[PDB]
Amino acid sequence: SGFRKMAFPSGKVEGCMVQVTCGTTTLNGLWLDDVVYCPRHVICTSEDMLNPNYEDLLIRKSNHNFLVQAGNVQLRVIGHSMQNCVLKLKVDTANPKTPKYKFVRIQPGQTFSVLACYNGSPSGVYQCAMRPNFTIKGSFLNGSCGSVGFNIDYDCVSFCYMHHMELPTGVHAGTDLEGNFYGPFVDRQTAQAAGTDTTITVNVLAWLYAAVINGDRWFLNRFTTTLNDFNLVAMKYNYEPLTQDHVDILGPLSAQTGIAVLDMCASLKELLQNGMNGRTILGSALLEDEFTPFDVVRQCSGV
Amino acid sequence: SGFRKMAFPSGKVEGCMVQVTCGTTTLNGLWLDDVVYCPRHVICTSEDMLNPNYEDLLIRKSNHNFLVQAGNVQLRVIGHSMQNCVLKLKVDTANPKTPKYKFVRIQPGQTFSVLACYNGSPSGVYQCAMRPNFTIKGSFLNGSCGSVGFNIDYDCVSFCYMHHMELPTGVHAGTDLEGNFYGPFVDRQTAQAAGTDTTITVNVLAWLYAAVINGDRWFLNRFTTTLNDFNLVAMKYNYEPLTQDHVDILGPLSAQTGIAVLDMCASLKELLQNGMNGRTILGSALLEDEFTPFDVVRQCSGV
Numbered sequence: 223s224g225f226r227k228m229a230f231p232s233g234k235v236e237g238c239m240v241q242v243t244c245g246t247t248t249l250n251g252l253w254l255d256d257v258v259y260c261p262r263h264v265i266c267t268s269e270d271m272l273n274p275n276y277e278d279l280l281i282r283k284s285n286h287n288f289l290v291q292a293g294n295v296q297l298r299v300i301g302h303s304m305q306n307c308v309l310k311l312k313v314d315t316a317n318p319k320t321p322k323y324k325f326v327r328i329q330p331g332q333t334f335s336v337l338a339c340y341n342g343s344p345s346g347v348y349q350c351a352m353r354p355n356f357t358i359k360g361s362f363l364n365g366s367c368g369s370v371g372f373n374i375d376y377d378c379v380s381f382c383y384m385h386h387m388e389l390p391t392g393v394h395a396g397t398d399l400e401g402n403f404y405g406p407f408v409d410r411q412t413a414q415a416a417g418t419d420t421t422i423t424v425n426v427l428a429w430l431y432a433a434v435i436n437g438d439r440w441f442l443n444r445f446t447t448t449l450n451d452f453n454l455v456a457m458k459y460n461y462e463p464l465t466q467d468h469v470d471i472l473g474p475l476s477a478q479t480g481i482a483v484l485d486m487c488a489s490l491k492e493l494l495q496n497g498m499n500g501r502t503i504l505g506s507a508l509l510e511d512e513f514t515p516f517d518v519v520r521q522c523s524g525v
Numbered sequence: 526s527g528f529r530k531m532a533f534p535s536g537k538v539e540g541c542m543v544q545v546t547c548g549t550t551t552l553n554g555l556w557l558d559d560v561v562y563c564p565r566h567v568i569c570t571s572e573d574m575l576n577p578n579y580e581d582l583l584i585r586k587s588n589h590n591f592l593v594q595a596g597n598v599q600l601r602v603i604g605h606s607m608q609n610c611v612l613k614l615k616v617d618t619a620n621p622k623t624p625k626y627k628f629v630r631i632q633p634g635q636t637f638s639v640l641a642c643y644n645g646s647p648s649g650v651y652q653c654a655m656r657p658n659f660t661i662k663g664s665f666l667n668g669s670c671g672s673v674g675f676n677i678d679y680d681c682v683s684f685c686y687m688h689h690m691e692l693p694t695g696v697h698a699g700t701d702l703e704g705n706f707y708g709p710f711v712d713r714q715t716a717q718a719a720g721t722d723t724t725i726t727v728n729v730l731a732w733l734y735a736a737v738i739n740g741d742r743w744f745l746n747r748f749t750t751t752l753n754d755f756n757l758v759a760m761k762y763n764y765e766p767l768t769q770d771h772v773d774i775l776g777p778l779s780a781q782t783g784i785a786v787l788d789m790c791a792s793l794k795e796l797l798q799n800g801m802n803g804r805t806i807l808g809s810a811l812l813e814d815e816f817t818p819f820d821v822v823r824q825c826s827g828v
């Protein structure tokens with residue numbers, strides 16, 4: 223028993239992290255087979271950051287402008303190309319530690335683990351959710367770009383995020399591993415701001431089920447609600463609408479606890495309207511929305 | 526910027542995890558050089574759990590009673606011995622992936638990363654604090670015993686915890702890697718219960734400093750307090766006394782933010798007496814005490 227924000231074990235990804243330097247800019251790269259992937263803004267200079275033309279900067283570069291170090295073995299760059307907001311640096315050695323992997327783009331509301339790195343060396347690992355507004359609430363300092371987010375399924379790493387920047391609100395923005403940004407952000411210099419965020423309703427419900435599985439029951443009631451009358455309340459509190467598919471996804475947790483999804487919705491409505499009155503759920507005084515139903519089942523299997 | 530509960534990268538520890546089976550009991554072991562360490566209750570059976578005599582059970586065992594698997598390469602046990610609540614199984618191969626390591630016992634109030642494992646295979650990684658009552662608030666299911674907690678300093682893994690059991694309150698208890706329990710617990714069957722816990726005051730202060738470093742300032746004031754008048758309030762709210770050494774440890778955070786430790790104490794006193802009135806700090810509606818000053822500096826270096 224117990225419930226914690228749990229990251230995937232990071233070893234398979236640690237073996238892929240390299241350091242990429244171009245000019246006086248050093249950041250992190252991801253070394254899979256004989257390609258290193260990194261953010262294309264590694265080729266920018268201070269004088270072209272408001273709106274660099276990345277195609278010009280790249281045509282003016284050669285292979286020898288890119289210094290790639292794995293630990294401190296130097297990898298020779300033998301080819302370079304741009305794919306959207308990511309650079310692909312072909313190197314003369316295939317990474318012997320290349321895991322089975324996929325490049326997957328995730329959906330708002332899904333979670334993943336982040337391996338924060340600096341200078342090619344892993345610093346720490348933590349769990350993030352892709353917010354409905356396509357930002358993530360992470361922990362990233364100068365030098366962390368090129369750090370990646372991932373899930374593991376069996377022994378296949380599905381990479382889903384590469385870090386590019388921090389917004390003025392302190393949240394973070396990046397791309398998938400094909401270099402396509404999550405959300406309406408660009409790797410330049412704008413006053414760029416995220417769209418208004420909402421709470422991931424299905425995840426809050428999943429987390430209430432985790433709480434029940436862990437003996438927290440004070441918020442339950444006999445009330446049930448209709449999906450319509452629940453979504454009326456959700457809209458008022460800036461929660462995303464709940465769909466029948468969300469109810470279906472919550473099925474196994476429903477069956478494990480014997481609490482119908484719409485009964486748990488009745489509990490959430492009461493929590494939204496009355497708050498907690500000084501009590502906690504799984505150690506939180508806020509309703510937590512960064513656990514998916516899968517995160518709960520994975521951690522709470524058999525109580 | 527940003528602040529998250531961050532674990533250490535788990536790769537160096539993943540390479541040490543093995544599966545240890547004796548009888549019908551399978552749990553996790555830690556393979557360093559030519560020794561596998563695991564909880565001694567792996568030799569228990571259902572009929573001797575209230576108070577096993579572990580010296581009898583062990584004398585009645587042979588090397589061939591212990592099946593040790595790394596991945597699925599079988600390691601031959603060539604020697605066995607008991608060290609307090611841990612077994613040391615000598616095996617015929619030194620672990621090629623053995624990192625530089627230390628066996629360190631930590632203090633209440635210090636943090637560490639846990640690599641939760643089942644059947645020798647790492648499941649996830651998360652950060653824990655050793656509570657003042659020598660329990661940890663983790664996430665452990667049946668089969669997780671032998672999972673270890675650790676810190677990393679440079680490239681040396683300091684192992685500090687091996688998991689043995691869950692208490693009735695849902696918290697967890699274990700030993701250091703010499704097999705000496707943290708706290709007044711035993712690896713048998715008792716109605717055993719933890720002593721009353723307290724809040725780690727120096728860590729709450731460190732976390733307030735992290736919040737300031739991340740732009741959360743609403744809880745500050747010009748008030749300052751004396752260390753004595755603060756500890757009077759702390760005692761009332763079940764917080765541990767703050768010492769001059771704690772004030773010294775908080776020095777660098779004090780200097781980085783320009784807020785004197787005793788000024789930050791004045792803020793904490795107000796927070797204890799008035800609560801937050803519906804606001805949050807670093808995304809929490811509770812005062813967080815599982816970040817050490819070191820955790821903050823490590824994550825918040827240079828804003």
Ligand SMILES: *C(=O)[C@H](C[C@@H]1CCNC1=O)NC(=O)[C@H](CC#C)NC(=O)/C=C/c1ccccc1
Pocket residue numbers: 249263362363364365366367368386387388389390394409410411412413526
């Ligand atoms: C890459 O390492 C770095 C990561 C951020 C540094 C500070 N915290 C980060 O996550 N990426 C950048 O610095 C990019 C570079 C480009 C283009 N730029 C930004 O993050 C811009 C931030 C900003 C904030 C407020 C106003 C303007 C720009």
Ligand SMILES: *C(=O)[C@H](C[C@@H]1CCNC1=O)NC(=O)[C@H](CC#C)NC(=O)/C=C/c1ccccc1
Pocket residue numbers: 223552566665666667668669670671689690691692693697712713714715716
């Ligand atoms: C080892 O894998 C296991 C870990 C716990 C299982 C359930 N969650 C755990 O963290 N260790 C045990 O099961 C040990 C074995 C011994 C001795 N026993 C307990 O954890 C006893 C728990 C308990 C709770 C309430 C009343 C009595 C006993």
